[PDB]
Amino acid sequence: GKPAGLNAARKLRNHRREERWADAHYKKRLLGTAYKSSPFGGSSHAKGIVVEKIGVEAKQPNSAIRKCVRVQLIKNGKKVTAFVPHDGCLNFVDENDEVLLSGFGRKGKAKGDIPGVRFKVVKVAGVGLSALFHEKKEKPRA
Amino acid sequence: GRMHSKGKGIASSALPYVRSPPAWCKADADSVVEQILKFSKKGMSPSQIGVTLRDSHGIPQVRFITGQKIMRILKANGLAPELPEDLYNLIKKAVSVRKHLERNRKDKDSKFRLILIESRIHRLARYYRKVGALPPTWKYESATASALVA
Amino acid sequence: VRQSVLADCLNNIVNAERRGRRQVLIRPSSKVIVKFLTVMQKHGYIDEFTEIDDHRSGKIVIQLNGRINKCGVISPRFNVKLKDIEKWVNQLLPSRQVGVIVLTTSRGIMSHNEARAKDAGGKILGFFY
Amino acid sequence: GKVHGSLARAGKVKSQTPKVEKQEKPKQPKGRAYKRLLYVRRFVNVTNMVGGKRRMNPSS
Amino acid sequence: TQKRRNNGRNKHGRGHVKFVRCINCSRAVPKDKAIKRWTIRNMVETAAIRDLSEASVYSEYTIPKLYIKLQYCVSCAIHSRVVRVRSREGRRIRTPP
RNA sequence: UUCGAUGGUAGGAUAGAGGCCUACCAUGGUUUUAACGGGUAACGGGGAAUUAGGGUUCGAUUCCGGAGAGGGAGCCUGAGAAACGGCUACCACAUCCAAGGAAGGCAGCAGGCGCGCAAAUUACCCAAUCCCGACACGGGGAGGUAGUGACAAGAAAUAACAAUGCAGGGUCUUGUAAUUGGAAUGAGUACAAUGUAAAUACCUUAACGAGGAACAAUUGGAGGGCAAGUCUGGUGCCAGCAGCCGCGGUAAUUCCAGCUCCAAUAGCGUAUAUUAAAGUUGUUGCAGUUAAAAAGCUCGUAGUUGAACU
RNA sequence: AACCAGGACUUUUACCUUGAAAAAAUUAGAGUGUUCAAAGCAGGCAAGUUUUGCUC
RNA sequence: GGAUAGUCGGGGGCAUUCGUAUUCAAUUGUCAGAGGUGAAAUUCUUGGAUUUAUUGAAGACGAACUACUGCGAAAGCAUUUGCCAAGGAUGUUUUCAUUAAUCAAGAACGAAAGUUAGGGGAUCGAAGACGAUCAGAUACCGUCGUAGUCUUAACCAUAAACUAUGCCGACUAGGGAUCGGGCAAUGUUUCUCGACUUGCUCGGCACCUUACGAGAAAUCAAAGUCUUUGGGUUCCGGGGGGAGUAUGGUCGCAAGGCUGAAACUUAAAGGAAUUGACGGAAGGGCACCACAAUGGAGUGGAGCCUGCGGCUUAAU
RNA sequence: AAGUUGGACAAACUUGGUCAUUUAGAGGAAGUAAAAGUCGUAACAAGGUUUCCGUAGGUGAACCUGCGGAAGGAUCAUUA
Ligand SMILES: [Zn+2]
């Protein structure tokens, strides 16, 4: 098994360092995937420019239209997808609305039955969510 | 375990707890020394002569009587071989295998055995060089292995 | 090749105790083994043991009286300071009142409690309880 | 990942649910008062005993 | 899952065994992995001994016999019923019936 | 290893040692104990977060040391600068212009544009700390004082005093009270005295100062994990939820509306990075016959380990 | 000579103990009634003269 | 570690002896089919097929004895004899005295198949050639037959290269077989020793029982002596795909070998074992809604009662 | 003093090459999420030619065949 000598620290350290790359967590954290390959740069939130709206089909055993939106990030111009939490707000969220996006919870993995979605809308046009659904605050003029 | 084999044989010799010559064996500790010197004058192996005193002469372990080993006695008396016994025997075996290999060119098993002997002879030579029983510059030679054995 | 005769001695002792045998034979013998056996015999875990003295490293026959749950060696022998004794006791010993850790300190081979009284650390040899 | 979607059917139910009214209610103290109030009625004033169900959200 | 401790054949302390050929199909089978059976037959039928004795010479001489050995692979032996599938407990019985 | 890489001799330069440089002489110096090169989404440390022990992550940031004033380069003064709130030259910016010309650097304190998910007054004062100077007195956007913020931390206000038919319990005691009266009233409104350089705030303090809109405390959840609905209306594998399982094809406890309760409380939730979980990085402390993994076998060097005895 | 005492005595260590030397802030933690607390390093006497001071 | 004695071994190399089998060639006796398959078909055979008798040649291969037996580091090694070098175990009051274990790197050997050439090429046989086969066969089947299977000199470097189980050291339960060695038998036998039997011991290949003990279980004398976790030391894995893929480097003339990712996606893949179900799997059976039976009667064949789908209508 | 001859520091500019990153790029070859269809066991049973590994050839597709191996087989078994 593992060496158990009083002067085997170099062997133990070298083996631990070499095998540490096997773990997905260590590999991700040290390869900088959260900045290079990720749509963000490690940011918790970001702003984007809306492109269009997509009714992505739901995988088995479900089948639904989730009124997601295709957005273009302001800082990079790349095209990604976003999810609208509130119901029936598709008419409220239009294109080129200067939307605000955040993560979903799995740190870069698809949610539920909809493949290709990792970001959700937190604020839209600067008015935010949770207000246009209860009619507490209306959208501003543009 | 065996150095270069999978065997685990334990055959050896169990020296007696006593460290004294037998009652009737009045070897007088000097006639045996003269016999050892005569047996070494011809040039027989120190192990082989020790066998001869054990079997023919009837002498017990020579240390129990003479007080010194066979190698030590002849070294003190000056009849010290240029190379150690195990070193010389391994070089002899290595030389014989190489002489067989240069004739039989299709013996890969013998070549492997030669490689094992070369590893064994080098490790023994390294130990003897460290212990100082040989001159520090004792690089073993493959071409002059015939010189080293003889 | 035998790397440490103390490990073989303690493994033989614990194996015999698990088997329930009242006597055990240890080969070979050394001063470290004798000192370790003296420590556990003084603490009461080991009965009389006799050292057979042949023209070799020697042999030991130990009378086992039970009351031993496990005796083992700690290899490699880490250097143990005064403040490390508590950590070793927590890691190895069942409790703070049961079990003994044997250290080869500057003043000799003795138990962890005696070494703590001596106010001197050393190297950890093994444990028994 | 599928090119299919009816944008008109989105928000179908929300546009057809009737809206009802809400009955006015007197003020209920909250915070420490509510915590104290629930403590005062936590073991004594009980009608959900005989069984140990202790249903704080009764259903009928 | 190692079904058999022998792994299907008896072989210990060896690395290679010269293969042989089956009989019904003549497949390549290892020498130990094959099934060896003995069929000692007579040169005449049990009811043909009387006819042979009536139509023979040399003072009712002893009729010879044929000794032949058959090597069967696993599939052929099972199909020919010289070897059959047994239960897990009954597999260990190496004694012939 | 040229155009200095290793060492020696001699010289020059430096405040001084020195291949720092020069001329000559030999080929040397580092390296699997990782030299050299590359990435760093890297200023380093005291330290911070998680907390059995061991460990893992962070340190731009109240202290210490280093570099810098858009980028290099050069220099005067001065004990001390390769200084930039000193100068000179070039490049990229921007700038008044009689088109001859002068010329400038807020990673200093406030403030402005832009990039932005993300961060405040173009406020007052040298009174306290100390610094500089020719100096008991001057100056100090160092520093102190205040102003705006949702959050970094510590203390508690939203109340309690009774009558009240009943559920009762036991003549003792809680409850909603479409109900009232007297009690204890603290924030605010406002002149005082303290506080302060002067003010803000704080402690004391002229007096006014609650009856329901009182002067309405909210954020998530109620199938499980993880706590709280087979309660009622609307759609009906659709709309949708849904971190995971999972629910939704008319009896929907999971969809949206009413009610109640649950956890927290001036806080709740969400996203991301990290830690514990993870004995899934295992030195403590993993696993390798079949789940991931013993190299086809052997020799054997660095490396590790090494019988007993003085 | 050595016999007594004094200065050095590790060949060379790892190891253990102890000591010297070595920033503060931080952490643990001693003491002290910011009305408690986060704090801070202040403080205390003495309730009959309101004590030209004393004590940590 | 090195001697030394009797050995032991299907351990290695070289030369060498034998064996029948297969194919082919000559000649001889004879004529109708021969081969092949479940049935065929192709092909050859009244010109002498197949068969049988003599002789000769070719290369390949060592059946039976061949075993839960042996040797070798592994791959592997089975005719006799001779030579050469070597190896383990055993015996030993033999010699040196720590000379040892493990291996990154580094090197030797390395099945079969594949490559370069030479020699050799009997049988089998990639590719291929034909004929049934099902609807299609294109593959299984039969005959022929290429590279290949043999050897020499150079290559590579992998397989289920397996004991799916790294190496060294110590301890741990009962039995009986088995190979090699040694010790003892006033035991049997044989024209000085051998064969047989019994007991003890060392070193191997293994087997049965048990589980103190381990594991998730199957099972394991090691996979035990591990939450009571530490004798020493190399290699290797961190959910499945992507993928042993691309790229990079390196060895090889080449096929290829070694080293060897990322993006993206998935909530599961996987191991053991249990219960049903299924099997063109086996073993016991049971049945005119199953067959055998020379079966008997029939329907279906012609025409009618009644019901079912198609058609019509308005309802049919 | 301006200017001038030499020495070093040398910013900066032209011409080319190398390194890291990015943006291109028609088009070619891959798998993953995949509209009906397509498709027979190649594998899961003796999966209907037992299975699988290495190697080579051939085939629209899994794949077929030759050589050598393993049971992870459907046989732990023939002492006569
Ligand atoms: Zn067969």
Side-chain angles (χ1 to χ4, degrees), chain E residues 7-32:
Chain E
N7 312 278
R9 60 202 193 99
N10 47 93
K11 169 175 168 295
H12 306 101
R14 289 172 282 276
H16 183 263
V17 202
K18 299 300 298 176
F19 83 133
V20 294
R21 315 288 294 188
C22 174
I23 301 305
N24 294 17
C25 79
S26 75
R27 199 211 183 279
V29 55
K31 176 182 176 61
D32 39 64

Side-chain angles (χ1 to χ4, degrees), chain A residues 39-98:
Chain A
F40 299 152
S43 63
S44 58
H45 302 253
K47 279 173 56 180
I49 297 301
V50 190
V51 156
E52 69 175 22
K53 299 92 182 180
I54 309 178
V56 168
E57 222 81 17
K59 78 172 63 181
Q60 299 284 332
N62 295 21
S63 59
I65 291 177
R66 305 293 287 182
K67 60 179 167 57
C68 79
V69 287
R70 185 76 176 182
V71 87
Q72 158 215 352
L73 289 183
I74 290 185
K75 82 177 196 67
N76 279 12
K78 57 200 308 175
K79 331 292 178 59
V80 292
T81 56
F83 208 11
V84 182
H86 293 92
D87 309 338
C89 295
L90 178 59
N91 64 329
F92 220 109
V93 278
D94 208 327
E95 199 257 2
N96 198 16
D97 280 5
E98 197 200 21

